[PDB]
Structures are given as C-alpha cells and as structure tokens.
C-alpha cells in the first residue's frame, strides 16, 4: 500500500522533529527502514522494528516492545535501525524530511 | 529476579521520559523501585525484548532494564 508508506514516512519525519533527532546522512538507510516499517504494518498491523529477527512476530506485536518507536528509542533514544539519530551521532545528517522518490526507489527493489 | 522484588539501579541508565526531566537526558542510577514485570514472553510465546525488567518508581514513572542494570535491595 502506497498510502501506508506515505503514512510511515510522515510518522518518521514528525517523530524525528518531536524528539530532536535526525535521519542518517545516507538517506538510503533511512529509506530502507521506513519501507520495512511500512511492510510490517501492512502484514502484522503494527510497525514492528524491521531490523530484527523474531521467533514469533505476532507475539512481538502483541507485547509491543519492538513496535516503532520501540521502548529503547522512547526511553533511551536508542535506535538500532539508524532511523532516528541524535545530533552527536557520527552518522546523523541535517535532514528530518526525506523525498518520497527516495522511498519509492527502494520499493522497486 | 521476580515481580515484586525491590531493586536499585546499579548501572548508568540515561532516559528521556522522566516526569521532571521530560525530553532531556537523565541518569536513573541510584533510584530504587519495584519490579512490575519481566517480559520474557507473551501468553507463553517467547518475545525478544532486550530490556525485559520493567521497574516502577514513584512519581508515576517506570522504565525498562536489562537484568544486569539493577540489583535486589
Ligand atoms: C536497515 C536495517 C538496519 O539495521 N540498518 C542500518 C544498517 C538498515 O539500513
Ligand atoms: S530501532 Fe526502534 S525506533 Fe528505531 S526504527 Fe527500529 S523500531 Fe523504530
């Protein structure tokens, strides 16, 4: 669903701004995570973190610990996926907004 | 480590959701609270939470920890 992707895109941009965090200087990383989140939301119903391996994705979504934004991000601003980075992170850029085309360049592959 | 146990944060744990420190870095080390839950699974199904020990402190504040970050009081 394209509306799901756009929704996830909007979520990421707004959450970054709200938490004073920034996207990776390499937006291709950002794009991969956002699309992954969107895919999980479409399949599981929740934006389960896409950069992890699960023994039971359905149970994970029910528990909610890894539903984006996850507990480590909400509490410690720790984002394993490298989606939301603090200003002092060596890989953080100056953007809190990503082009829709960039996201779709990932969708095709 | 069980629900109900009284624990103290014995490691550096910096959070941003503390009531009197919302959106700003705050180290919980030294704070004492009670274990509210241990997220090892959901209704019998194994889950992979990496901060399974949910501890509740006063001021209507709670946070998650790894077993090694807290100590029984
Ligand atoms: C996608 C998942 C993840 O962890 N990362 C950072 C290298 C991605 O780009
Ligand atoms: S590490 Fe957490 S905050 Fe970051 S993308 Fe994954 S689920 Fe979202």
């Amino acid at each position: 669903n394209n509306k799901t992707l756009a929704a996830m895109k909007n979520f990421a941009e707004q959450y970054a701004k709200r938490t004073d965090t920034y996207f990776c200087s390499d937006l291709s990383v950002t794009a991969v995570v956002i699309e992954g989140l969107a895919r999980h939301k479409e399949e599981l119903g929740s934006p389960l973190c896409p950069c992890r391996h699960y023994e039971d994705k359905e149970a994970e979504v029910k528990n909610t610990f890894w539903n984006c934004p996850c507990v480590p991000m909400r509490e410690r601003k720790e984002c394993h996926c490298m989606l939301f980075l603090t200003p002092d992170n060596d890989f953080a850029g100056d953007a809190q907004d990503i082009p829709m085309e960039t996201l779709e360049e990932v969708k095709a592959s | 480590m069980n629900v109900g146990d009284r624990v103290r944060v014995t490691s550096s744990v910096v959070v941003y959701h503390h009531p009197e420190h919302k959106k700003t870095a705050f180290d919980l080390q030294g704070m004492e609270g009670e274990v509210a839950a241990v997220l090892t699974e959901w209704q019998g199904r194994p889950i992979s939470a990496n901060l399974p020990v949910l501890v509740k402190f006063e001021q209507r504040f709670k946070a998650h920890f790894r077993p090694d970050e807290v100590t029984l009081i």
Side-chain angles (χ1 to χ4, degrees), chain B residues 20-59:
Chain B
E20 303 192 65
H21 296 286
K22 33 188 172 183
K23 286 194 169 183
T24 75
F26 185 60
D27 199 322
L28 309 180
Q29 177 144 33
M31 297 183 65
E32 287 174 38
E34 179 179 303
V35 178
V38 180
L39 313 179
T40 49
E41 36 86 309
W42 188 77
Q43 291 195 305
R45 305 168 188 170
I47 54 177
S48 66
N50 62 1
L51 301 175
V53 186
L54 175 58
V55 181
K56 296 192 189 309
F57 306 79
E58 190 56 292
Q59 312 169 61

Side-chain angles (χ1 to χ4, degrees), chain A residues 17-19 52-56 58-60 62-63 65-66 71-78 86, chain B residues 12-17 23 39 41-42 45-52 62-66 69:
Chain A
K17 301 183 185 186
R18 181 187 185 68
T19 61
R52 310 187 70 66
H53 298 178
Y54 307 98
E55 300 189 65
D56 196 313
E58 301 88 301
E60 296 279 21
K62 305 303 290 68
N63 170 290
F65 185 100
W66 286 121
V71 164
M73 179 60 205
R74 283 185 279 119
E75 291 181 16
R76 313 187 179 193
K77 280 193 169 178
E78 300 185 349
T86 58
Chain B
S12 178
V13 175
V14 182
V15 301
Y16 297 76
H17 68 311
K23 286 194 169 183
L39 313 179
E41 36 86 309
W42 188 77
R45 305 168 188 170
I47 54 177
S48 66
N50 62 1
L51 301 175
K62 67 178 186 304
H64 298 69
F65 304 80
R66 297 172 61 84
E69 302 176 313

Side-chain angles (χ1 to χ4, degrees), chain A residues 85-100:
Chain A
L85 306 176
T86 58
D88 62 296
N89 189 302
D90 291 316
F91 310 118
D94 65 13
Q96 294 180 306
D97 301 273
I98 187 171
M100 179 52 89

Side-chain angles (χ1 to χ4, degrees), chain A residues 29 32-33 51 80-81:
Chain A
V29 175
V32 172
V33 177
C51 296
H80 164 271
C81 299

Side-chain angles (χ1 to χ4, degrees), chain A residues 8 29-41 44 46-54 57 66-68 79-81 83:
Chain A
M8 203 55 72
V29 175
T30 308
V32 172
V33 177
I34 290 174
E35 184 171 306
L37 283 169
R39 201 167 191 177
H40 270 176
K41 181 167 178 55
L44 305 64
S46 291
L48 183 58
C49 185
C51 296
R52 310 187 70 66
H53 298 178
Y54 307 98
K57 288 186 178 179
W66 286 121
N67 286 342
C68 193
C79 177
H80 164 271
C81 299
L83 176 54

